[PDB]
């Protein structure tokens, strides 16, 4: 009753590693298990010492495979994915299926965070709906995966002093107690603290600002500095916007942005990057380029 579905999951993951998707019934049982697992996770999750943080993925499944090849296989290396899994990429279904399958199998070795593109509206617009239909001829998948996205923890807290989250931080939020005191079991509202965590981003203009994106704000440096000090964090890490170098140090080593989807914006042709937190919480970055097609 226990090792049997473990073997089933391992077979699923192996099948997925060859761009071979699952049957909608498999996806259904998988999303049920993943809901069961995610329901036991606070809005601000805690992860032990050594991890490998990776950011925006966006369905580039073959580049996710390249990533795994760079930073190690699934159970050996602890991972932390900060959202934006599924859109603007062809293999969205495979990407999210693999990440969820991992999270279900090795519930301790990997942690996935909610992202701007996990709400039904944004997926329905930007494409995940279309791939769900094309690859399945239904919406049952796109229903399951969205009813699962409504459970992903909003933030993670590595060794109590690294704050990892898609997007950025919000004015309605002053301390991790506040985030931990939200209700994340809903679709992303259009305005709230949730629609800013997963939508805001740093900038140059100090203090709060208006986000040209249309949702969330643009927290200046002082905001991040006072937030870090008031929460004891040593660094806030995020991944929401393209950075051609692969990872940018905004707000004087207070905020890091780590895009982890190479060649995302083709006019720019970025290189992806991931961050490694070793046994002593010392970060070291790895920049990689798209796989050979």
């Amino acid at each position: 009753d226990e090792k049997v579905f473990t073997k089933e999951l391992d077979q699923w993951i192996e099948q997925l590693n060859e761009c071979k998707q699952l049957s909608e019934s498999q996806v259904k049982s998988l999303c049920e298990k993943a809901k069961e697992i995610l329901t036991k996770e606070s809005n601000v999750q805690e992860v032990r010492c050594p991890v490998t943080v990776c950011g925006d993925v966006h369905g580039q499944f073959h580049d996710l495979m390249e990533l795994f090849r760079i930073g190690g296989k699934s159970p050996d290396t602890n991972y932390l994915f900060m959202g934006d899994y599924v859109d603007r990429g062809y293999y969205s279904v495979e990407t999210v299926t693999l990440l969820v399958a991992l999270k279900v199998r090795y519930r301790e070795r990997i942690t996935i965070l909610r992202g701007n593109h996990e709400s039904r509206q944004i997926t329905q617009v930007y494409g995940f709906y279309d791939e769900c239909l094309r690859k399945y001829g239904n919406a049952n998948v796109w229903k399951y995966f969205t009813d699962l996205f409504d459970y992903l923890p909003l933030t993670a807290l590595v060794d109590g002093q690294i704050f990892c989250l898609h997007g950025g931080l919000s004015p309605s939020i002053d301390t991790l107690d506040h985030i931990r005191a939200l209700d994340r079991l809903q679709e992303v509202p259009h305005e709230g603290p949730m629609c800013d965590l997963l939508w805001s981003d740093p900038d140059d203009r100090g203090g709060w600002g208006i986000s040209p994106r249309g949702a969330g704000y643009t927290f200046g440096q002082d905001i991040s500095e006072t937030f870090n000090h008031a929460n004891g964090l040593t660094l806030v890490s995020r991944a929401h916007q393209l950075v051609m170098e692969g990872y940018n140090w905004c707000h004087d080593r207070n905020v890091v942005t780590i895009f982890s989807a190479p060649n995302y914006c083709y006019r720019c042709g970025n290189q992806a990057a991931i961050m490694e937190l070793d046994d002593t919480l010392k970060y070291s970055f790895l920049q990689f380029d798209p796989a050979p097609r």
Binding site: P50, R69, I70, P75, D76, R107, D278, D279, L286, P292
Partner: protein, 554 residues
């Protein structure tokens, strides 16, 4: 009655039962008599044949062996109508099997008359079916000593231009095959007509068919030099590429100096296929050309190529390695190695690959110190793909070039790989480490490597500890349980107390792995305590993996 049940089984809905009926025409042949066979089934297999195209082909194949159960040559005429109705099918391969069965079954005077009839049928088809029935009638008349000599020549000449681009291409491409069975005078007249048609080849596929005909002529047909000059003139991008396709066959035959010049010229998109053919041309030259006539063209082609393309260069180098000893070959190899030092990675890949032929030429152990720098800088570049390829090549050349030669420096490279960040690089390093130990024996192993990795077993980054664990896992397979239980096992048992759970459950994995290597008493004494201790952990993964190790061996 047998014809009727054949129709009924052929009226079956299921394709599989019908296909069985197809595979079971010999049953009806043995049922009826050979005379009754010829008199009845032949009209049936002539008129009532309507099924799936694959099933039609299957019927043709089952028919291909029906030159005997009809009654032999004296009745070949009775077999010609059906094949005619099967030589006019819209699908190419079906009428092709029809032509095959015709040539198989073809007293051949009746076959010749019916071959003139099939030529008349080809006169109706304004597509490649005309050329198909023409090639059929060719062999069908040849079975009667090519009595339709003028008919075969006229059929080939009409296929040379019959407003049928399909049949015209078929003729202008395989006149050497269709007019092969035709009479020698008919074959020569059709060869003249084929030269005319290849001159008349205007389109790109027409240019490819013309190149094919010219290659067939230069192969089988000063007349040889005249045809070769006409082909070379036709060869000097699309048409140039279609001609470079057969340029290798032209050079694969003083009778080729002009061909080698044309190959070195056209390559200096048509250049891509030109150099592709020039690979085989260089092989054939280095195998056949005369050293006096070689030197000049060899140096010219080397200067040109050294200026896909690198792949052809490496192929030509490996081929010209057939020369006994050429200092110019040494200079070319040095230049290509310095290129592979700073060029696309495929350069170094092909260079280290053909290093086998290089050592076969003179012995790469001499030039070792020449290539060594490139090697090391190829092991320390940015794009981890390149370092990965270099690692993959490393054990080949290492075991190829003795122990001490590499043990001076390259051991540091193996270590630098083992400590690298990119996981794929560490994986390749461990695999090639296993290859190295397999080739260099446990004495050299325990003397050189094992201490270094076991020293690596302690350092901050837990990745750089699991890598030592994996090295142990892959060494145990070949290092023999003695050295394992002497050195490896203590470190594994010690790491079984690492704080990071990843290290611990990898310890469990490696313990399960190397278990069977070890001794049962050693197992029960040492590892089982550690195993249950790990099972007493709190991480669910390490618990699961320790339980797996238990239930797989203990």
């Amino acid at each position: 009655y047998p014809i009727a049940v054949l129709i009924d089984e052929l009226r079956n809905e299921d394709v599989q039962l019908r296909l069985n009926s197809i595979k079971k025409l010999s049953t009806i042949a043995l049922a009826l008599g050979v005379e009754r066979t010829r008199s009845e089934l032949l009209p049936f297999l002539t008129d009532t044949i309507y099924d799936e195209d694959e099933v039609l082909l299957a019927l043709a194949e089952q028919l291909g062996t029906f030159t005997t159960l009809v009654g032999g040559p004296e009745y070949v005429h009775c077999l010609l109508p059906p094949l005619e109705s099967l030589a006019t099918v819209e699908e190419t391969v079906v009428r092709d099997k029809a032509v095959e069965s015709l040539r198989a079954i073809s007293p051949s005077d009746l076959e010749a008359h019916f071959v003139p009839l099939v030529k008349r049928l080809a006169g109706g088809d304004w597509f490649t079916s005309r050329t198909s029935a023409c090639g059929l009638f060719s062999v069908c008349y040849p079975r009667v000593s090519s009595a339709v000599k003028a008919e075969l020549r006229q059929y080939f000449r009409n296929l040379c231009s019959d407003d049928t681009p399909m049949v015209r291409r078929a003729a202008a491409s395989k006149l050497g095959e269709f007019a092969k069975v035709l009479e020698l005078d008919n074959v020569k007249s059709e060869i003249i007509p084929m030269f005319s048609n290849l001159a008349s080849d205007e389109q790109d596929s027409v240019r490819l068919l013309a190149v094919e005909a010219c290659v067939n002529i230069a192969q089988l047909l000063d007349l040889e030099a005249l045809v070769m000059p006409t082909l070379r003139q036709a060869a000097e991008w699309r048409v140039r590429y279609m001609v470079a396709d057969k340029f290798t066959e032209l050079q694969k035959a003083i009778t080729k100096t002009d061909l080698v010049p044309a190959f070195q010229n056209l390559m200096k998109e048509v250049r891509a296929a030109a150099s592709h053919k020039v690979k085989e041309f260089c092989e054939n030259l280095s195998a056949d050309c005369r050293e006096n006539v070689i030197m000049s063209q060899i140096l010219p082609c080397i200067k040109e190529l050294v200026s896909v393309k690198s792949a052809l260069a490496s192929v030509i180098m490996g081929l010209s390695p057939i020369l006994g000893k050429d200092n110019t070959i040494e200079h070319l190899l040095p230049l290509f190695l310095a290129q592979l030092k700073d060029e696309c990675p495929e350069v170094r890949l092909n260079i280290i690959s053909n290093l086998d032929c290089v050592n076969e030429v003179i012995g790469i152990r001499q030039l070792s110190q020449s290539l060594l720098p490139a090697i090391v800088e190829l092991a320390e570049d940015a794009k981890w793909r390149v370092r990965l390829a270099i690692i993959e090549y490393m054990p080949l050349l290492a075991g190829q070039l003795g122990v001490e030669f590499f043990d001076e420096k390259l051991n540091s490279l193996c270590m630098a790989w083992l400590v690298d960040h990119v996981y794929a690089i560490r994986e390749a390093a461990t695999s090639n480490l296993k290859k190295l130990v397999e080739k260099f024996g446990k004495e050299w192993a325990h003397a050189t490597i094992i201490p270094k990795v076991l020293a690596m077993s302690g350092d901050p980054n837990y990745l750089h500890r699991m890598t030592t664990l994996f090295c142990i896992n892959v060494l145990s397979e070949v290092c023999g349980q003695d050295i394992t239980t002497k050195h490896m096992l203590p470190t594994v048992l010690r790491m079984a107390g690492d704080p990071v759970a990843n290290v611990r459950f990898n310890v469990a994995k490696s313990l399960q792995k190397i278990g069977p290597i070890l001794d049962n008493s050693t197992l029960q004494s040492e590892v089982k305590p550690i195993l249950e201790k790990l099972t007493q952990d709190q991480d669910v993964d390490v618990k699961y993996f320790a339980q797996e190790a238990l239930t797989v061996l203990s």
